[PDB]
Design a protein around this ligand. Sequence first.
Ligand SMILES: CC[C@H](NC)C(=O)N[C@@H]1C(=O)N2[C@@H](CC[C@@H]1CO)CC[C@H]2C(=O)NCc1ccc(C(C)(C)C)cc1
Ligand SMILES: [Zn+2]
Length: 99
Amino acid sequence: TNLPRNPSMADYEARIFTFGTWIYSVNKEQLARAGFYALGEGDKVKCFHCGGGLTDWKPSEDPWEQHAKWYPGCKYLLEQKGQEYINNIHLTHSLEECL
Ligand SMILES: CC[C@H](NC)C(=O)N[C@@H]1C(=O)N2[C@@H](CC[C@@H]1CO)CC[C@H]2C(=O)NCc1ccc(C(C)(C)C)cc1
Ligand SMILES: [Zn+2]
């Protein structure tokens, strides 16, 4: 049902390879472990499983967190971090708006 959108990038090694020319603050090993691979069009990266694309990284920012924040539907994310992790990121935002 929920098959990788890009099965060619399903291996960690495939993904890190893409970060050859990586010159940006955010750690390429962390991006890769969170399912992303670089597009060589700035700091743009894309999730191999959900196909979600992300840009304009700041130095502090966590790939996993951003993955959940923007693309919580990903099956890879769910297998790797679980329901609670994803829902936690979203409830956190709701509490911020509430108080
Ligand atoms: C990476 C964290 C960063 N920190 C501000 C950030 O939140 N970026 C976001 C961010 O990158 N976002 C979100 C909205 C904008 C924000 C602010 O830019 C949701 C879509 C995503 C976004 O604009 N992605 C650009 C993008 C979309 C698609 C693609 C493709 C088509 C997968 C190749 C590449 C790049
Ligand atoms: Zn994903």
